[PDB]
Amino acid sequence: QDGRPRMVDVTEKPETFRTATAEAFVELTEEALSALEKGGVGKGDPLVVAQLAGILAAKKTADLIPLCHPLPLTGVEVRVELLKAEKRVRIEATVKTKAETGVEMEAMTACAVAALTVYDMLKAASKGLVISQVRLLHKAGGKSGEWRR
Amino acid sequence: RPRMVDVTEKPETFRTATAEAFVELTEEALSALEKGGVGKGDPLVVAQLAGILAAKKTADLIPLCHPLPLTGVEVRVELLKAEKRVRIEATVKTKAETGVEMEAMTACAVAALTVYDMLKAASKGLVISQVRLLHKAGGKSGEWRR
Amino acid sequence: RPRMVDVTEKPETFRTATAEAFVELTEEALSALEKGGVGKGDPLVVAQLAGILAAKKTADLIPLCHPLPLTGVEVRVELLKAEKRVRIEATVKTKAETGVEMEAMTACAVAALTVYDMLKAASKGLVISQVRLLHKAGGKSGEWRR
Amino acid sequence: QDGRPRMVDVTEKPETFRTATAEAFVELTEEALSALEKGGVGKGDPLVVAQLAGILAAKKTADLIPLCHPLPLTGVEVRVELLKAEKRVRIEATVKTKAETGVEMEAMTACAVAALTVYDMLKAASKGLVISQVRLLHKAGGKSGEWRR
Amino acid sequence: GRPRMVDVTEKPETFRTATAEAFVELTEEALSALEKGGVGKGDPLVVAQLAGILAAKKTADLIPLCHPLPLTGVEVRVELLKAEKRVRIEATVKTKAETGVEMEAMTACAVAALTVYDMLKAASKGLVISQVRLLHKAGGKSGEWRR
Amino acid sequence: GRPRMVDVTEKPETFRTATAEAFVELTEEALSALEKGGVGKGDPLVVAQLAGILAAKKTADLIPLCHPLPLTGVEVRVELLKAEKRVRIEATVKTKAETGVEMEAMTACAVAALTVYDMLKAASKGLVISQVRLLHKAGGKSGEWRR
Ligand SMILES: Nc1nc2c(ncn2[C@@H]2O[C@H](COP(=O)(O)OP(=O)(O)OP(=O)(O)O)[C@@H](O)[C@H]2O)c(=O)[nH]1
Ligand SMILES: Nc1nc2c(ncn2[C@@H]2O[C@H](COP(=O)(O)OP(=O)(O)OP(=O)(O)O)[C@@H](O)[C@H]2O)c(=O)[nH]1
Ligand SMILES: Nc1nc2c(ncn2[C@@H]2O[C@H](COP(=O)(O)OP(=O)(O)OP(=O)(O)O)[C@@H](O)[C@H]2O)c(=O)[nH]1
Ligand SMILES: Nc1nc2c(ncn2[C@@H]2O[C@H](COP(=O)(O)OP(=O)(O)OP(=O)(O)O)[C@@H](O)[C@H]2O)c(=O)[nH]1
Ligand SMILES: Nc1nc2c(ncn2[C@@H]2O[C@H](COP(=O)(O)OP(=O)(O)OP(=O)(O)O)[C@@H](O)[C@H]2O)c(=O)[nH]1
Ligand SMILES: Nc1nc2c(ncn2[C@@H]2O[C@H](COP(=O)(O)OP(=O)(O)OP(=O)(O)O)[C@@H](O)[C@H]2O)c(=O)[nH]1
């Protein structure tokens, strides 16, 4: 019984309210930005589709992250705004639940997939786009307690 | 209006894509990682496999993305001690009417998310940064690089 | 803005939902079905199982739908010769902050789609009609019926 | 080797261009209609979300329909309009591909799930809503050839 | 030494085929339940035969380094062998691609077996899935292979 | 007689646990490949052990009448037994719910085995998955059960 892959046993940990908020950014290029403001490259609105994709991702997290716990989610929010001046798209997501485990991954993942979704909705205009700074901003509940960046 | 771009008209040509991602480590992260993980298993070994799997699940995560038959997938996950970084690279190949830039980008992203998952117990200040396309080729498009 | 409705605040109460669907048959469909299918297997046996499975996959099909632990699923698939109809009914139960009307509606819909798949070789004029909620109960909501 | 469930062998059938178009309707009630025109019951725009859900469904078809063939899809279109006067929401989808098998199910399924999605986006306003007349409108390619309702 | 999905880009898409089987040893209690039609959960074999077909289609999702594949065909047969008190599962999967379908056929049986077990464990938790093996395969380089 | 997901609504959510194992018979060629680190696809056991964990989480998706479940824990161990020329797989799954986790544990091993097979079939297509059985289970009504 060495240090090998395993899903930590949290059977005896209580069922407390958990939450987590994350964010991701997408660095745009002129062409990219030009298209976005024109409504996309013909596939639909990048932000609208990516926003829904980010929510769906939150629900598929345990399917993408190997040692992650399957959890019923009680809430999922996702914001996908365009920071016109900075040439950036900003995604932020907040997930909530009632289980023995946290939801930092459901939050982190929601942001990464919505980021990938914006990329797919605009790579035809420019493939140099970059997804940057995907990071956690807060979480609460359980034992660790509150946390903010 | 949203929609999956019709490509029935185009032919099956070889397609290849290569991307990469970075996870910025905190000493607390790098120390755990080096001692074998935070107690959940080698963070990198798990990230790499999760990356190959993410490439296979791409079309089910990216809404307008085209379902394709992956013909090859490589994923590299390496620790850069001096840089306090985890570098991830993925190459996806296929034969179809569309590129695999998503599969590659997705493989890197999810691998990164897995590095985060295997180390966040040591630090939640970990940052996934620069998931970007390095190389791509095939069909009409042609060559392209960072 | 789209979003999965926060219910962390509410308690886990028993929840139940019952829906149904109909597939209008053409003589060409009913004749195949009665002879055992169009050659792919009992259309109804397959529809019923597909329905139970659809109930389990609901949250992955309905975007804002809440992930829940299903605690029970019943699906009935019956031929109504005189009516040239296929009647489908599904009841889903659970214990959580939200109802299972989707699971039940989804179970019926997909079962219906399966009846169509097992018979369309005989007729593509088959119609899925009236997928609707029959009964529902649990928590704040209370009773409700067609 | 009797008449039991099986995925028909189409290995020796050629790879021809296939297409299929289907449609589904959702009968609304006043409350339902009132909310839809007001932008939904708080979860987002029913038509916008259902439209994306219908596309995604098209890709999960083989996962929902037991004896259905796994196929690379080459195209997917979905229309989700509100027929204000008839108190109906009309969904229509068209799928395309290049394989030995048709895509009538990818089309039928896209419509049924988008219908379910509109239901979920409005059941809070009225649960009496009904999904009706999900049917095929056309298909082409392969052997059967053209077909229209 | 690291894991990966083998590059088969330059290989030609041909007719591939694989056939594997699986066995489920039945205890007397479980066999009796099977003959009565199951523990009231449903018909063990009927449900299992379907689980195998669906299974085969989810193969690439369960085997990490497996290649995703459009399947041209899937055949599954689940039978009872009273005398040996065993359930037998045979599956033949067919495709046109650069890689074989041994995994789809192999997984088809394993999961079908797992389903027999689920449908009867209420009677005997000790039931065993005894033999999941490849019987035949064909297509491409190595050509026809037989057990 | 029709199939269905058994109603367990009125049962209490308790600590459930199940442990099952699986074996993979190795031919001399395959064993040799295993000791060298595999056929160049990656480390058979490492990859398999992960496939089992993921597998267990996809259980409800593969077994038709199975109950979906939040899993509190999943343990998988994959070892080589040179002398018997066998790979052994043990999996223990844990949850808090109205139903047992025998399927999650049972499927964890079967799929892990299927993965060993995938990682080594290049060397020997004849490798066999010989024994997938339940070793222990606990929680609820029947309580502790042992092979
Ligand atoms: N400006 C420009 N637009 C393009 C080009 N190719 C396609 N488009 C537009 O963008 C859409 C295609 O999106 P892409 O991301 O390039 O390809 P895709 O196959 O749709 O998406 P994936 O399956 O995720 O790879 C088309 O329907 C057009 O609306 C191009 O070369 N230049
Ligand atoms: N260094 C360190 N390790 C911890 C700490 N808390 C838990 N661990 C270790 O890491 C494991 C928990 O991993 P987490 O990612 O925090 O939680 P998890 O539920 O296992 O993982 P998720 O389901 O992905 O959220 C424990 O079983 C220990 O092995 C901590 O505060 N510091
Ligand atoms: N008018 C009205 N609106 C409600 C009621 N309950 C919830 N809502 C609104 O509708 C949203 C909830 O949608 P519902 O479909 O009822 O429940 P849900 O859990 O979000 O959706 P499912 O997980 O698919 O069952 C809330 O966020 C509010 O915006 C209600 O009782 N009356
Ligand atoms: N009565 C009748 N049966 C047909 C016809 N064509 C095919 N069949 C039978 O039905 C099977 C084909 O089913 P289809 O649904 O048309 O095609 P499929 O590829 O098997 O099914 P999908 O993947 O869901 O599209 C054949 O293998 C025969 O068993 C037809 O024109 N009339
Ligand atoms: N010794 C031996 N090695 C082989 C043979 N064929 C392929 N290999 C090696 O094993 C790898 C191929 O693995 P396989 O499992 O046969 O095929 P695969 O397509 O990669 O795997 P699947 O998609 O799961 O079928 C090659 O990249 C080589 O490293 C063979 O016939 N004999
Ligand atoms: N003979 C016998 N039958 C049982 C027992 N427990 C349950 N049953 C019967 O089998 C059904 C339960 O099936 P199980 O497989 O034990 O449990 P399950 O939760 O339905 O199935 P899973 O979700 O796959 O674990 C009940 O509805 C009864 O029909 C038992 O202990 N002995």
PDB file of N, CA, C and O in Angstrom, chain F residues 17-65:
ATOM      1  N   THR F  17     -19.509  -0.833   1.292  1.00  0.00           N
ATOM      2  CA  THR F  17     -18.160  -1.165   0.866  1.00  0.00           C
ATOM      3  C   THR F  17     -18.117  -2.507   0.146  1.00  0.00           C
ATOM      4  O   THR F  17     -18.816  -3.441   0.517  1.00  0.00           O
ATOM      5  N   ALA F  18     -17.302  -2.590  -0.898  1.00  0.00           N
ATOM      6  CA  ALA F  18     -17.164  -3.828  -1.658  1.00  0.00           C
ATOM      7  C   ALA F  18     -15.737  -4.000  -2.157  1.00  0.00           C
ATOM      8  O   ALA F  18     -15.048  -3.024  -2.474  1.00  0.00           O
ATOM      9  N   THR F  19     -15.296  -5.251  -2.220  1.00  0.00           N
ATOM     10  CA  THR F  19     -13.954  -5.561  -2.685  1.00  0.00           C
ATOM     11  C   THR F  19     -14.019  -6.782  -3.579  1.00  0.00           C
ATOM     12  O   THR F  19     -14.561  -7.819  -3.187  1.00  0.00           O
ATOM     13  N   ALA F  20     -13.474  -6.650  -4.783  1.00  0.00           N
ATOM     14  CA  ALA F  20     -13.457  -7.746  -5.747  1.00  0.00           C
ATOM     15  C   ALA F  20     -12.066  -7.821  -6.347  1.00  0.00           C
ATOM     16  O   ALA F  20     -11.271  -6.898  -6.167  1.00  0.00           O
ATOM     17  N   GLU F  21     -11.770  -8.916  -7.047  1.00  0.00           N
ATOM     18  CA  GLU F  21     -10.474  -9.079  -7.698  1.00  0.00           C
ATOM     19  C   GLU F  21     -10.609  -9.630  -9.122  1.00  0.00           C
ATOM     20  O   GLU F  21     -11.668 -10.105  -9.523  1.00  0.00           O
ATOM     21  N   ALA F  22      -9.517  -9.565  -9.875  1.00  0.00           N
ATOM     22  CA  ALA F  22      -9.495 -10.047 -11.240  1.00  0.00           C
ATOM     23  C   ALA F  22      -8.106 -10.554 -11.541  1.00  0.00           C
ATOM     24  O   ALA F  22      -7.119  -9.997 -11.044  1.00  0.00           O
ATOM     25  N   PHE F  23      -8.035 -11.600 -12.365  1.00  0.00           N
ATOM     26  CA  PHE F  23      -6.763 -12.188 -12.755  1.00  0.00           C
ATOM     27  C   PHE F  23      -6.564 -12.189 -14.263  1.00  0.00           C
ATOM     28  O   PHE F  23      -7.518 -12.304 -15.027  1.00  0.00           O
ATOM     29  N   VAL F  24      -5.309 -12.063 -14.677  1.00  0.00           N
ATOM     30  CA  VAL F  24      -4.936 -12.071 -16.085  1.00  0.00           C
ATOM     31  C   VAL F  24      -3.783 -13.054 -16.282  1.00  0.00           C
ATOM     32  O   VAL F  24      -2.654 -12.781 -15.862  1.00  0.00           O
ATOM     33  N   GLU F  25      -4.082 -14.192 -16.912  1.00  0.00           N
ATOM     34  CA  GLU F  25      -3.090 -15.227 -17.185  1.00  0.00           C
ATOM     35  C   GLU F  25      -2.119 -14.730 -18.239  1.00  0.00           C
ATOM     36  O   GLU F  25      -2.532 -14.250 -19.289  1.00  0.00           O
ATOM     37  N   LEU F  26      -0.826 -14.854 -17.965  1.00  0.00           N
ATOM     38  CA  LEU F  26       0.192 -14.389 -18.898  1.00  0.00           C
ATOM     39  C   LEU F  26       0.886 -15.509 -19.639  1.00  0.00           C
ATOM     40  O   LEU F  26       1.268 -16.502 -19.039  1.00  0.00           O
ATOM     41  N   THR F  27       1.037 -15.350 -20.950  1.00  0.00           N
ATOM     42  CA  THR F  27       1.754 -16.341 -21.753  1.00  0.00           C
ATOM     43  C   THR F  27       3.209 -15.933 -21.556  1.00  0.00           C
ATOM     44  O   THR F  27       3.488 -14.815 -21.109  1.00  0.00           O
ATOM     45  N   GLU F  28       4.137 -16.819 -21.886  1.00  0.00           N
ATOM     46  CA  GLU F  28       5.547 -16.503 -21.712  1.00  0.00           C
ATOM     47  C   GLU F  28       5.945 -15.227 -22.461  1.00  0.00           C
ATOM     48  O   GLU F  28       6.647 -14.380 -21.911  1.00  0.00           O
ATOM     49  N   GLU F  29       5.491 -15.088 -23.707  1.00  0.00           N
ATOM     50  CA  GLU F  29       5.813 -13.910 -24.518  1.00  0.00           C
ATOM     51  C   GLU F  29       5.316 -12.627 -23.858  1.00  0.00           C
ATOM     52  O   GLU F  29       6.048 -11.638 -23.762  1.00  0.00           O
ATOM     53  N   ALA F  30       4.068 -12.655 -23.397  1.00  0.00           N
ATOM     54  CA  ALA F  30       3.463 -11.498 -22.754  1.00  0.00           C
ATOM     55  C   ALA F  30       4.141 -11.183 -21.432  1.00  0.00           C
ATOM     56  O   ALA F  30       4.346 -10.020 -21.108  1.00  0.00           O
ATOM     57  N   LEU F  31       4.484 -12.213 -20.664  1.00  0.00           N
ATOM     58  CA  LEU F  31       5.155 -11.991 -19.386  1.00  0.00           C
ATOM     59  C   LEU F  31       6.480 -11.281 -19.620  1.00  0.00           C
ATOM     60  O   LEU F  31       6.831 -10.350 -18.895  1.00  0.00           O
ATOM     61  N   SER F  32       7.211 -11.729 -20.641  1.00  0.00           N
ATOM     62  CA  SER F  32       8.500 -11.139 -20.986  1.00  0.00           C
ATOM     63  C   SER F  32       8.320  -9.672 -21.332  1.00  0.00           C
ATOM     64  O   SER F  32       9.100  -8.822 -20.901  1.00  0.00           O
ATOM     65  N   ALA F  33       7.287  -9.387 -22.123  1.00  0.00           N
ATOM     66  CA  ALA F  33       6.970  -8.017 -22.521  1.00  0.00           C
ATOM     67  C   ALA F  33       6.644  -7.194 -21.279  1.00  0.00           C
ATOM     68  O   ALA F  33       7.081  -6.053 -21.147  1.00  0.00           O
ATOM     69  N   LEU F  34       5.883  -7.777 -20.362  1.00  0.00           N
ATOM     70  CA  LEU F  34       5.529  -7.068 -19.144  1.00  0.00           C
ATOM     71  C   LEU F  34       6.773  -6.667 -18.351  1.00  0.00           C
ATOM     72  O   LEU F  34       6.892  -5.533 -17.898  1.00  0.00           O
ATOM     73  N   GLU F  35       7.709  -7.594 -18.203  1.00  0.00           N
ATOM     74  CA  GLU F  35       8.925  -7.314 -17.455  1.00  0.00           C
ATOM     75  C   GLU F  35       9.822  -6.270 -18.126  1.00  0.00           C
ATOM     76  O   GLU F  35      10.605  -5.589 -17.451  1.00  0.00           O
ATOM     77  N   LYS F  36       9.712  -6.132 -19.446  1.00  0.00           N
ATOM     78  CA  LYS F  36      10.519  -5.140 -20.149  1.00  0.00           C
ATOM     79  C   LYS F  36       9.830  -3.779 -20.069  1.00  0.00           C
ATOM     80  O   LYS F  36      10.411  -2.757 -20.423  1.00  0.00           O
ATOM     81  N   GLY F  37       8.589  -3.765 -19.595  1.00  0.00           N
ATOM     82  CA  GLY F  37       7.867  -2.510 -19.483  1.00  0.00           C
ATOM     83  C   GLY F  37       6.734  -2.368 -20.484  1.00  0.00           C
ATOM     84  O   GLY F  37       6.197  -1.273 -20.680  1.00  0.00           O
ATOM     85  N   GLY F  38       6.367  -3.476 -21.122  1.00  0.00           N
ATOM     86  CA  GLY F  38       5.285  -3.448 -22.091  1.00  0.00           C
ATOM     87  C   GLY F  38       5.744  -3.488 -23.537  1.00  0.00           C
ATOM     88  O   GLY F  38       6.942  -3.494 -23.817  1.00  0.00           O
ATOM     89  N   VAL F  39       4.782  -3.507 -24.456  1.00  0.00           N
ATOM     90  CA  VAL F  39       5.059  -3.549 -25.885  1.00  0.00           C
ATOM     91  C   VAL F  39       5.429  -2.178 -26.461  1.00  0.00           C
ATOM     92  O   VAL F  39       5.447  -1.994 -27.678  1.00  0.00           O
ATOM     93  N   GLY F  40       5.715  -1.213 -25.594  1.00  0.00           N
ATOM     94  CA  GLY F  40       6.072   0.117 -26.065  1.00  0.00           C
ATOM     95  C   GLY F  40       4.870   1.036 -26.078  1.00  0.00           C
ATOM     96  O   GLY F  40       4.923   2.157 -26.572  1.00  0.00           O
ATOM     97  N   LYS F  41       3.775   0.544 -25.516  1.00  0.00           N
ATOM     98  CA  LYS F  41       2.526   1.289 -25.449  1.00  0.00           C
ATOM     99  C   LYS F  41       2.497   2.074 -24.143  1.00  0.00           C
ATOM    100  O   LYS F  41       1.818   3.101 -24.035  1.00  0.00           O
ATOM    101  N   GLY F  42       3.244   1.562 -23.164  1.00  0.00           N
ATOM    102  CA  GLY F  42       3.317   2.160 -21.844  1.00  0.00           C
ATOM    103  C   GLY F  42       3.339   1.062 -20.785  1.00  0.00           C
ATOM    104  O   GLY F  42       3.280  -0.126 -21.112  1.00  0.00           O
ATOM    105  N   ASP F  43       3.413   1.442 -19.514  1.00  0.00           N
ATOM    106  CA  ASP F  43       3.455   0.458 -18.434  1.00  0.00           C
ATOM    107  C   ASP F  43       2.082  -0.167 -18.180  1.00  0.00           C
ATOM    108  O   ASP F  43       1.223   0.453 -17.561  1.00  0.00           O
ATOM    109  N   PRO F  44       1.872  -1.415 -18.636  1.00  0.00           N
ATOM    110  CA  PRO F  44       0.609  -2.147 -18.476  1.00  0.00           C
ATOM    111  C   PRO F  44      -0.121  -1.973 -17.144  1.00  0.00           C
ATOM    112  O   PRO F  44      -1.285  -1.557 -17.109  1.00  0.00           O
ATOM    113  N   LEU F  45       0.564  -2.280 -16.051  1.00  0.00           N
ATOM    114  CA  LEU F  45      -0.041  -2.186 -14.733  1.00  0.00           C
ATOM    115  C   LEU F  45      -0.377  -0.770 -14.293  1.00  0.00           C
ATOM    116  O   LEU F  45      -1.436  -0.538 -13.696  1.00  0.00           O
ATOM    117  N   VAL F  46       0.516   0.177 -14.573  1.00  0.00           N
ATOM    118  CA  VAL F  46       0.280   1.567 -14.184  1.00  0.00           C
ATOM    119  C   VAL F  46      -1.000   2.063 -14.849  1.00  0.00           C
ATOM    120  O   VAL F  46      -1.917   2.542 -14.182  1.00  0.00           O
ATOM    121  N   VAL F  47      -1.055   1.928 -16.172  1.00  0.00           N
ATOM    122  CA  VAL F  47      -2.218   2.346 -16.942  1.00  0.00           C
ATOM    123  C   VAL F  47      -3.472   1.593 -16.518  1.00  0.00           C
ATOM    124  O   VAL F  47      -4.539   2.192 -16.411  1.00  0.00           O
ATOM    125  N   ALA F  48      -3.348   0.291 -16.271  1.00  0.00           N
ATOM    126  CA  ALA F  48      -4.503  -0.510 -15.865  1.00  0.00           C
ATOM    127  C   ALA F  48      -5.095  -0.052 -14.533  1.00  0.00           C
ATOM    128  O   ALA F  48      -6.309   0.069 -14.391  1.00  0.00           O
ATOM    129  N   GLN F  49      -4.230   0.203 -13.559  1.00  0.00           N
ATOM    130  CA  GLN F  49      -4.661   0.646 -12.239  1.00  0.00           C
ATOM    131  C   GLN F  49      -5.490   1.931 -12.325  1.00  0.00           C
ATOM    132  O   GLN F  49      -6.411   2.141 -11.540  1.00  0.00           O
ATOM    133  N   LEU F  50      -5.162   2.790 -13.282  1.00  0.00           N
ATOM    134  CA  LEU F  50      -5.888   4.036 -13.460  1.00  0.00           C
ATOM    135  C   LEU F  50      -7.228   3.775 -14.145  1.00  0.00           C
ATOM    136  O   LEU F  50      -8.249   4.372 -13.791  1.00  0.00           O
ATOM    137  N   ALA F  51      -7.207   2.882 -15.129  1.00  0.00           N
ATOM    138  CA  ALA F  51      -8.410   2.514 -15.872  1.00  0.00           C
ATOM    139  C   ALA F  51      -9.460   1.930 -14.941  1.00  0.00           C
ATOM    140  O   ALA F  51     -10.652   2.085 -15.182  1.00  0.00           O
ATOM    141  N   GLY F  52      -9.016   1.261 -13.877  1.00  0.00           N
ATOM    142  CA  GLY F  52      -9.945   0.677 -12.920  1.00  0.00           C
ATOM    143  C   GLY F  52     -10.666   1.724 -12.090  1.00  0.00           C
ATOM    144  O   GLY F  52     -11.861   1.602 -11.805  1.00  0.00           O
ATOM    145  N   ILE F  53      -9.930   2.759 -11.695  1.00  0.00           N
ATOM    146  CA  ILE F  53     -10.484   3.843 -10.903  1.00  0.00           C
ATOM    147  C   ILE F  53     -11.494   4.572 -11.763  1.00  0.00           C
ATOM    148  O   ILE F  53     -12.631   4.785 -11.355  1.00  0.00           O
ATOM    149  N   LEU F  54     -11.081   4.958 -12.962  1.00  0.00           N
ATOM    150  CA  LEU F  54     -12.001   5.638 -13.853  1.00  0.00           C
ATOM    151  C   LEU F  54     -13.196   4.722 -14.102  1.00  0.00           C
ATOM    152  O   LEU F  54     -14.344   5.135 -13.994  1.00  0.00           O
ATOM    153  N   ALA F  55     -12.918   3.463 -14.401  1.00  0.00           N
ATOM    154  CA  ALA F  55     -13.971   2.488 -14.653  1.00  0.00           C
ATOM    155  C   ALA F  55     -15.029   2.539 -13.563  1.00  0.00           C
ATOM    156  O   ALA F  55     -16.192   2.805 -13.834  1.00  0.00           O
ATOM    157  N   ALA F  56     -14.622   2.295 -12.326  1.00  0.00           N
ATOM    158  CA  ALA F  56     -15.558   2.303 -11.210  1.00  0.00           C
ATOM    159  C   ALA F  56     -16.498   3.504 -11.228  1.00  0.00           C
ATOM    160  O   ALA F  56     -17.661   3.383 -10.850  1.00  0.00           O
ATOM    161  N   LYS F  57     -16.002   4.659 -11.663  1.00  0.00           N
ATOM    162  CA  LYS F  57     -16.826   5.857 -11.710  1.00  0.00           C
ATOM    163  C   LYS F  57     -17.822   5.849 -12.871  1.00  0.00           C
ATOM    164  O   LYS F  57     -18.798   6.604 -12.854  1.00  0.00           O
ATOM    165  N   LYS F  58     -17.581   5.005 -13.871  1.00  0.00           N
ATOM    166  CA  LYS F  58     -18.466   4.925 -15.030  1.00  0.00           C
ATOM    167  C   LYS F  58     -19.381   3.718 -14.936  1.00  0.00           C
ATOM    168  O   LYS F  58     -20.148   3.440 -15.854  1.00  0.00           O
ATOM    169  N   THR F  59     -19.303   3.002 -13.819  1.00  0.00           N
ATOM    170  CA  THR F  59     -20.111   1.808 -13.624  1.00  0.00           C
ATOM    171  C   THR F  59     -21.593   1.937 -14.025  1.00  0.00           C
ATOM    172  O   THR F  59     -22.063   1.182 -14.875  1.00  0.00           O
ATOM    173  N   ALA F  60     -22.321   2.885 -13.432  1.00  0.00           N
ATOM    174  CA  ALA F  60     -23.748   3.062 -13.714  1.00  0.00           C
ATOM    175  C   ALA F  60     -24.016   3.280 -15.193  1.00  0.00           C
ATOM    176  O   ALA F  60     -25.140   3.121 -15.675  1.00  0.00           O
ATOM    177  N   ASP F  61     -22.969   3.628 -15.920  1.00  0.00           N
ATOM    178  CA  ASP F  61     -23.104   3.874 -17.337  1.00  0.00           C
ATOM    179  C   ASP F  61     -22.967   2.607 -18.167  1.00  0.00           C
ATOM    180  O   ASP F  61     -23.352   2.589 -19.337  1.00  0.00           O
ATOM    181  N   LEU F  62     -22.411   1.558 -17.568  1.00  0.00           N
ATOM    182  CA  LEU F  62     -22.192   0.315 -18.281  1.00  0.00           C
ATOM    183  C   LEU F  62     -23.154  -0.806 -17.875  1.00  0.00           C
ATOM    184  O   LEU F  62     -23.464  -1.675 -18.685  1.00  0.00           O
ATOM    185  N   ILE F  63     -23.602  -0.792 -16.622  1.00  0.00           N
ATOM    186  CA  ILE F  63     -24.523  -1.804 -16.106  1.00  0.00           C
ATOM    187  C   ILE F  63     -25.881  -1.107 -16.123  1.00  0.00           C
ATOM    188  O   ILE F  63     -26.132  -0.192 -15.343  1.00  0.00           O
ATOM    189  N   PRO F  64     -26.782  -1.554 -17.013  1.00  0.00           N
ATOM    190  CA  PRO F  64     -28.131  -1.011 -17.195  1.00  0.00           C
ATOM    191  C   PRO F  64     -29.035  -0.673 -16.010  1.00  0.00           C
ATOM    192  O   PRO F  64     -29.529   0.444 -15.908  1.00  0.00           O
ATOM    193  N   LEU F  65     -29.246  -1.645 -15.122  1.00  0.00           N
ATOM    194  CA  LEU F  65     -30.133  -1.498 -13.962  1.00  0.00           C
ATOM    195  C   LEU F  65     -29.388  -1.130 -12.680  1.00  0.00           C
ATOM    196  O   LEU F  65     -29.912  -1.265 -11.579  1.00  0.00           O
TER     197      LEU F  65
END
